[PDB]
Design an enzyme around this catalytic site. Structure first.
Site, PDB file in Angstrom:
ATOM      1  N   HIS A 129     100.949  35.618  71.251  1.00 45.15           N
ATOM      2  CA  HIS A 129      99.889  34.598  71.024  1.00 45.15           C
ATOM      3  C   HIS A 129      99.795  33.659  72.232  1.00 45.15           C
ATOM      4  O   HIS A 129     100.635  32.761  72.345  1.00 45.15           O
ATOM      5  CB  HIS A 129     100.153  33.850  69.722  1.00 45.15           C
ATOM      6  CG  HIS A 129     100.492  34.727  68.574  1.00 45.15           C
ATOM      7  ND1 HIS A 129     101.776  34.859  68.133  1.00 45.15           N
ATOM      8  CD2 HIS A 129      99.740  35.542  67.803  1.00 45.15           C
ATOM      9  CE1 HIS A 129     101.808  35.701  67.122  1.00 45.15           C
ATOM     10  NE2 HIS A 129     100.586  36.119  66.890  1.00 45.15           N
ATOM     11  N   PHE A 137     104.403  31.267  53.727  1.00 39.74           N
ATOM     12  CA  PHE A 137     103.491  30.101  53.699  1.00 39.74           C
ATOM     13  C   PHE A 137     102.273  30.490  52.851  1.00 39.74           C
ATOM     14  O   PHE A 137     101.422  31.276  53.299  1.00 39.74           O
ATOM     15  CB  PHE A 137     103.173  29.667  55.134  1.00 39.74           C
ATOM     16  CG  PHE A 137     104.256  30.030  56.115  1.00 39.74           C
ATOM     17  CD1 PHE A 137     105.499  29.420  56.044  1.00 39.74           C
ATOM     18  CD2 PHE A 137     104.044  30.985  57.098  1.00 39.74           C
ATOM     19  CE1 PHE A 137     106.513  29.774  56.920  1.00 39.74           C
ATOM     20  CE2 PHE A 137     105.055  31.331  57.981  1.00 39.74           C
ATOM     21  CZ  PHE A 137     106.284  30.723  57.890  1.00 39.74           C
ATOM     22  N   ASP A 194      99.057  30.715  51.512  1.00 41.23           N
ATOM     23  CA  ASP A 194      97.705  30.364  51.993  1.00 41.23           C
ATOM     24  C   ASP A 194      96.694  31.302  51.329  1.00 41.23           C
ATOM     25  O   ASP A 194      96.985  31.835  50.232  1.00 41.23           O
ATOM     26  CB  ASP A 194      97.690  30.400  53.526  1.00 41.23           C
ATOM     27  CG  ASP A 194      97.795  31.795  54.128  1.00 41.23           C
ATOM     28  OD1 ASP A 194      98.029  32.777  53.375  1.00 41.23           O
ATOM     29  OD2 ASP A 194      97.604  31.887  55.356  1.00 41.23           O
ATOM     30  N   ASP A 215     105.848  36.968  57.130  1.00 39.72           N
ATOM     31  CA  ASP A 215     104.585  36.195  57.020  1.00 39.72           C
ATOM     32  C   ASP A 215     103.840  36.279  58.358  1.00 39.72           C
ATOM     33  O   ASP A 215     102.637  36.586  58.371  1.00 39.72           O
ATOM     34  CB  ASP A 215     104.840  34.750  56.592  1.00 39.72           C
ATOM     35  CG  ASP A 215     103.565  34.036  56.206  1.00 39.72           C
ATOM     36  OD1 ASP A 215     102.631  33.984  57.050  1.00 39.72           O
ATOM     37  OD2 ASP A 215     103.500  33.568  55.064  1.00 39.72           O
ATOM     38  N   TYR A 216     104.518  35.981  59.465  1.00 40.50           N
ATOM     39  CA  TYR A 216     103.900  36.024  60.810  1.00 40.50           C
ATOM     40  C   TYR A 216     103.208  37.381  61.024  1.00 40.50           C
ATOM     41  O   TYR A 216     102.045  37.426  61.496  1.00 40.50           O
ATOM     42  CB  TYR A 216     104.962  35.820  61.886  1.00 40.50           C
ATOM     43  CG  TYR A 216     105.503  34.426  62.080  1.00 40.50           C
ATOM     44  CD1 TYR A 216     104.965  33.307  61.459  1.00 40.50           C
ATOM     45  CD2 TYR A 216     106.535  34.230  62.978  1.00 40.50           C
ATOM     46  CE1 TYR A 216     105.460  32.033  61.712  1.00 40.50           C
ATOM     47  CE2 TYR A 216     107.034  32.965  63.251  1.00 40.50           C
ATOM     48  CZ  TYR A 216     106.500  31.862  62.609  1.00 40.50           C
ATOM     49  OH  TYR A 216     106.983  30.618  62.895  1.00 40.50           O
ATOM     50  N   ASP A 247      99.038  38.138  61.088  1.00 38.83           N
ATOM     51  CA  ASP A 247      98.444  38.796  62.288  1.00 38.83           C
ATOM     52  C   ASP A 247      97.732  40.074  61.843  1.00 38.83           C
ATOM     53  O   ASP A 247      96.631  40.368  62.335  1.00 38.83           O
ATOM     54  CB  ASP A 247      99.492  39.087  63.363  1.00 38.83           C
ATOM     55  CG  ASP A 247      99.863  37.882  64.215  1.00 38.83           C
ATOM     56  OD1 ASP A 247      99.287  36.791  64.011  1.00 38.83           O
ATOM     57  OD2 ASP A 247     100.721  38.053  65.083  1.00 38.83           O
TER      58      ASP A 247
END
Length: 339
Positions: free
Chosen positions: A51, A235, A237, A312-313, A317
């Protein structure tokens, strides 16, 4: 009163009327992650390496950049994909969460100290509109809330923490749980707590992503070495539930799918909204357990600890890179400051 996010999610998932965790899908996602487990996508280095908008440095400046981006890390979706906020930075175009990071980097490059609480404690609504300005006709959602939250957060950072989020990190004494609690107790906008079946449940989406991103920007070292980093959950969301539903790990009722397909807006703490969030969070816990069992079975010795943060990451993505594939099961629509 208050269950922690992990306990909250188990309780929600076990009592859910409209959202179901599919054991077959949990296995599927775990097998997908296993093939990627040696890649930069499931290591702490990927947060920087994959990123370009993320800070290169592991310094106080970078820690404050993570503080400001996670303080405003909520509600980037638009009603149509043709009609959305876009921010250009260094000749590249960014939408959704990345448009916020682009706008922060654009401001810093202009010499506006947007990551300094001495600045954002008293930044006006006019100034925030300019800093977050879209390169399209469509503004970033909830700019008035972003202004109010910056002022609230900067005032507290100056008064209680010497104007730097690095002081909060140092006070956490290499505990991810202590940092999470310090943030939720100190900064009202981070109090991501609601009701389910008359119990107080917590999600702490922004407080946990702030701890995870602090770990990531400091490369899991020094002030960002967290002995208990594995204790942080996903997280909760709107993009993660959508990609778990796409991959078959989450199943929705007809009443709930009806709302999603029509774009019926859910409200924060609605039973169905809480079930989506709690089931997603518990779903990643189960995927992580399954993945670690698969890695044990292949007799593998991972070169790093796989945890819920890293899953999660990866999956967020994946959502970003496969948005076209996921049209058929929409993300749930909500306007709130928590995510």
């Amino acid at each position: 009163g208050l269950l922690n996010p992990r306990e909250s999610s188990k309780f929600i998932a076990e009592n859910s009327r409209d959202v179901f965790i599919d054991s077959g899908g949990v296995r599927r996602v775990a097998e997908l992650l296993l093939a990627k487990a040696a890649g930069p996508e499931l290591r702490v280095e990927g947060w920087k390496a994959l990123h370009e908008l993320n800070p290169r440095a592991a310094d106080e400046a970078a820690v404050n950049w993570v503080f400001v981006t996670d303080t405003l890390n909520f509600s980037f979706w638009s009603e149509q994909d043709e009609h959305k906020c876009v921010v250009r930075y260094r000749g590249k175009t960014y939408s959704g969460y990345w448009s916020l990071c682009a706008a922060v980097n654009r401001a810093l490059d202009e010499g506006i100290p947007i990551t300094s609480a001495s600045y954002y404690a008293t930044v006006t609504l006019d100034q925030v509109r300019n800093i977050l300005r879209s390169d399209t006709d469509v503004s970033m959602p909830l700019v008035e809330e972003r202004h109010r939250i910056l002022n609230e957060t900067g005032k507290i950072l100056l008064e209680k923490f010497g104007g730097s989020f690095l002081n909060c990190v140092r006070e956490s004494e290499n505990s991810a749980q202590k940092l999470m609690h310090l943030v939720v107790e100190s900064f009202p906008s981070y109090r991501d707590v609601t009701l389910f079946e008359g119990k107080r449940v917590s999600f702490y989406k922004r407080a946990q992503i702030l701890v995870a991103d602090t770990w990531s920007v400091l490369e899991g070292k020094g002030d960002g070495c967290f002995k208990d980093i594995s204790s942080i959950t996903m997280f909760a969301d709107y993009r993660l539930p959508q990609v778990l539903a796409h991959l078959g790990a989450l199943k929705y009722s007809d009443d709930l799918l009806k709302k999603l397909l029509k774009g019926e807006m859910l409200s924060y703490g609605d039973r169905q909204e809480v079930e989506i969030r709690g089931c997603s969070l518990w779903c990643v816990e189960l995927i992580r357990d399954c993945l670690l069992e698969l890695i044990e079975q292949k007799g593998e010795k991972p070169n790093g600890e796989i945890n819920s943060i890293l899953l999660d990451y990866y999956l967020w993505d994946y959502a970003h890179d496969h948005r076209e594939d996921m049209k058929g099961i929409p993300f749930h629509r909500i306007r709130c400051i928590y995510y």
